[PDB]
């Protein structure tokens, strides 16, 4: 038995600079995962252990991928540096723990990448306007990859605290139009990203342009929601994992919306991408996404 | 973020030298676990992820203890070799404080819980100890049992006789190596089964009435160390009912009824029927690793 490598957030960052290297293996993983028993992924739905005394939670997210031949576990905490994560990478041939690495950078990057994959498939024709609700870590990681991958004529932002949206707009490279309400930000928007910690709906279907695509990334708890019933039930609903969406997403559970497809099914050709219709991609994240990122990082680090 | 501490196997051993210090917090943890919600332990049943391509398995064992105010996760692999690591978090903010070897922790806490069960359940006049198996668990059980108890004779059987002789010459006191399980258990007051046998090796017919058995091996729903006569005739104690019903082939395949959790005995909710033949079926649970990891981390961080 020997000690694992430790890779800091900076070291992870140094080995995850290129979305063109992250997107392809994510697409493959989503597809393989959605094949279920016809693929090679073993991923139990995330386990959450409450830490009631301190208003905290520990998420446990193991996965094995036969196709990548990779074995990982992400451990994530949230306390009401509030979000923290670590990823463990094992030698799949003998179980040895090879690496413990920061999970924060990975969470930022793989989440944004999965949203970008969904948007490539689901954005309507004439997607000129992007709208981001929220101004935190995920707002930044999404903005980064979306402006790399796509060309929008306008990017808009609303945030609960306007000052933080204005800081965002000052910090990032391109022009961001800070809006005074959600309604203003989303009216006329073709692609929407919701990356907030809202617990009750902030985005109402009445305001959404027919055909818009929404990446619904927040409200990551079964009692929490970012979207109203009109939007959840009017939109064609795509998810990352059916099992996770029906356990963890308040938007899905409380609206009672039918799930049309997993993103992986669209990628593999099993289900259609109805980009012309108003679409919601409800994202929860899942262990195999962390596995893909951790493997990329580890392979890059270990090869020099 | 601050880098976590990494504690190797030898550093863990260096900070778990005293069973005297490990037993009391384990007793409290077992009692609190068995109290259920009001005991403050959050411990989901072990998740096992198969790695079929390499004939392996990953088990993930998280726990929170309100009483100790500690948050851990053990990750263990078994490949058809067992390797474990324990992560210890700051419970107030989720920061990863330590990554430590899990093999030494597992060896120590398992032996300690067997010792707790044995203190409660060994028959009056217990003079003879028998160990079946001769691997890591045999060593840890031997160390703590000869420290906590006073046996007049210790016997051992192992499938491979050479490894039992190596054990007998390696450990401090006298060990009588026996050529069969039956020989080793005949007349024994306390028995420890620490093998990877998949089919029964220990038959109730051979067990002295009143004997206490710590059944530590066959840690899979399709594996067994004990026969039906022993499992059905003995008073059956476990660490976790839920885990025993999911993970133990001895319990599942025999159809035996579980009398009590060890924690219920400790708290007084269930009696210790030490006069009867008793089996403590140990699966292990996350809160035991939590106790040991906290003791280790606290000792190490103190200097
Ligand atoms: N689908 C997935 O895979 C992943 C999901 N997430 C989820 O994404 C969301 C954003 O995460 P992250 O960027 O790291 O978090 P951050 O803490 O960095 O930012 C949180 C954002 O939510 C806003 N906010 C907090 N409370 C409310 C509220 N009551 N109403 C409206 N906005 C609010 C904040 O605004 P303000 O400036 O006013 O404080 C801020 O813009 C979270 O819900 C998170 O759980 C994260 C990663 C994985
Ligand atoms: N209840 C709990 O909390 C814990 C449970 N365990 C379980 O305890 C047992 C021992 O673990 P450990 O000491 O680490 O393992 P080791 O690998 O160190 O030793 C294995 C032992 O099992 C024997 N053995 C292997 N196959 C058979 C067989 N078919 N029949 C009879 N004996 C056999 C070996 O004998 P030989 O020399 O001939 O190979 C050896 O004595 C295992 O079953 C393990 O899963 C351990 C961790 C915690
Ligand atoms: N959503 C991000 C960050 C995040 C992680 C965790 I653990 C969180 O706590 C809970 C609490 C109860 C639950 O039932 C669930 I599901 C999650 C929250 I709120 C957010 C991620 O997945 O990393
Ligand atoms: N018993 C020791 C070591 C150990 C750990 C693991 I993961 C093992 O593999 C499986 C495979 C399928 C299962 O259903 C179960 I339950 C366990 C085995 I065999 C042994 C411990 O608990 O650490
Ligand atoms: K659309
Ligand atoms: K007894």
UniProtKB/Swiss-Prot annotation, chain B:
SUPFAM superfamilies: NAD(P)-binding Rossmann-fold domains
Biological process, per Gene Ontology: negative regulation of transcription by RNA polymerase II; sensory perception of sound; thyroid hormone metabolic process; thyroid hormone transport
Keywords: Cytoplasm, NAD, NADP, Oxidoreductase
EC identifiers of the protein: 1.5.1.25, 1.5.1.1
Pfam families in alphabetical order: OCD_Mu_crystall
Location relative to the cell: Cytoplasm
Binding site for 3,3',5-triiodo-L-thyronine: 46, 247
Annotated GO CC locations: cytosol; mitochondrion; nucleus
Predominant location: cytoplasm
UniProt tissue specificity: Expressed in the spiral ligament of the cochlea (at protein level).
Transmembrane intervals: none
Binding site for NADPH: 81-82, 109, 134, 136-137, 158-160, 163, 195-196, 216, 282
Catalysed transformations (reactions): L-pipecolate + NADP(+) = Delta(1)-piperideine-2-carboxylate + NADPH + H(+); L-pipecolate + NAD(+) = Delta(1)-piperideine-2-carboxylate + NADH + H(+); L-proline + NADP(+) = 1-pyrroline-2-carboxylate + NADPH + H(+); L-proline + NAD(+) = 1-pyrroline-2-carboxylate + NADH + H(+)
InterPro entries in UniProt: NAD(P)-bd_dom_sf (IPR036291), ODC_Mu_crystall (IPR003462), ODC_N (IPR023401)
GO molecular function, one term: transcription corepressor activity
Cited PANTHER family: KETIMINE REDUCTASE MU-CRYSTALLIN (PTHR13812:SF19)
Family: Belongs to the ornithine cyclodeaminase/mu-crystallin family.
Quaternary structure and interacting proteins, as annotated: Homodimer. Binds the thyroid hormone triiodothyronine (T3); T3 binding inhibits enzymatic activity.
Known function: Catalyzes the NAD(P)H-dependent reduction of imine double bonds of a number of cyclic ketimine substrates, including sulfur-containing cyclic ketimines. Under physiological conditions, it efficiently catalyzes delta(1)-piperideine-2-carboxylate (P2C) and delta(1)-pyrroline-2-carboxylate (Pyr2C) reduction, suggesting a central role in lysine and glutamate metabolism. Additional substrates are delta(2)-thiazoline-2-carboxylate (T2C), 3,4-dehydrothiomorpholine-3-carboxylate (AECK), and (R)-lanthionine ketimine (LK) that is reduced at very low rate compared to other substrates.
Protein name: Ketimine reductase mu-crystallin
């Amino acid at each position: 038995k020997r000690a694992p490598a430790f890779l800091s957030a900076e070291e992870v960052q140094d080995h995850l600079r290129s979305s063109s290297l992250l997107i392809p293996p994510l697409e493959a993983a989503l597809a393989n995962f959605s094949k279920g028993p016809d693929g090679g992924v073993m991923q139990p739905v995330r386990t959450v252990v409450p830490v009631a005394k301190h208003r905290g939670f520990l998420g446990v997210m193991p996965a094995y991928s036969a196709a990548e031949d990779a074995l990982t576990t992400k451990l994530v905490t949230f306390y009401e540096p509030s979000h923290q994560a670590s990823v463990l990478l094992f030698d799949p041939s003998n179980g040895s723990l090879l690496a413990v690495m920061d999970g924060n950078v990975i969470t930022a990057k793989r989440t944004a990448a999965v949203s970008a994959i969904a948007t490539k498939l689901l954005k309507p024709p004439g997607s000129d306007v992007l709208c981001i609700l929220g101004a935190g870590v995920q707002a930044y990681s999404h903005y980064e990859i979306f402006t790399e991958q796509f060309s929008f004529k306008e990017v808009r932002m609303w945030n609960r605290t306007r000052e933080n949206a204005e800081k965002f707009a000052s910090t990032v490279q391109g022009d961001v139009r800070v809006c005074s309400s959600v309604q203003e930000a989303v009216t006329g928007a073709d692609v929407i990203i919701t990356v907030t910690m809202a617990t009750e709906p902030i985005l109402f279907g009445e305001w959404v342009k027919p055909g818009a695509h929404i990446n619904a990334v927040g409200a990551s708890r079964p009692d929490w929601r970012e979207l109203d019933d009109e939007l959840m039930r009017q939109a064609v609903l795509y998810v990352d994992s059916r099992e996770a969406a029906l356990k963890e997403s308040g938007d899905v559970l409380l609206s009672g919306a039918d799930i049309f497809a997993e993103l992986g099914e669209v990628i593999s050709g099993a289900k259609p991408a109805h980009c012309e219709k108003t679409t919601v991609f409800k994202s929860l994240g899942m262990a195999v996404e962390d596995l893909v990122a951790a493997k990329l990082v580890y392979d890059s680090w270990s090869s020099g």
